[PDB]
Design a protein around this ligand. Sequence first.
Ligand code: I6W
Ligand code: I77
Ligand code: PXY
Ligand code: 8VH
Ligand code: 8VH
Ligand code: OXE
Length: 9
Amino acid sequence: LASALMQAL
Ligand SMILES: *C(=O)c1ccc(-c2ccc(C(=O)OCC)cn2)nc1
Ligand SMILES: *NNC(=O)c1ccc(-c2ccc(C(N)=O)cn2)nc1
Ligand SMILES: Cc1ccc(C)cc1
Ligand SMILES: Cc1cccc(C)c1
Ligand SMILES: Cc1cccc(C)c1
Ligand SMILES: Cc1ccccc1C
C-alpha cells in the first residue's frame, strides 16, 4: 500500500 501511494514521489 505505501508503495502504491509513494509512486507519486
Ligand atoms: C503497497 O503499496 C505494497 C505493500 C507491500 C508490497 C510488497 C511487495 C513485494 C514484497 C516482496 O517481495 O516480499 C518478499 C518477502 C512484499 N511486499 N508492495 C506494495
Ligand atoms: N515517486 N517515485 C519516483 O519518482 C521514482 C522514479 C523512479 C524510481 C526508480 C527506482 C529504482 C530504479 C531501478 N532501476 O532500480 C529505477 N527507478 N524511483 C522512484
Ligand atoms: C506516503 C506518501 C505518499 C505520497 C505522498 C505525496 C505523500 C506521502
Ligand atoms: C505501482 C508500483 C509502484 C512501485 C513498484 C511497482 C512494481 C509498481
Ligand atoms: C514506490 C516508492 C517511491 C518512492 C519511495 C519509495 C520508498 C517507494
Ligand atoms: C518491491 C519494491 C517496492 C517499492 C520499491 C522498490 C521495490 C523493489
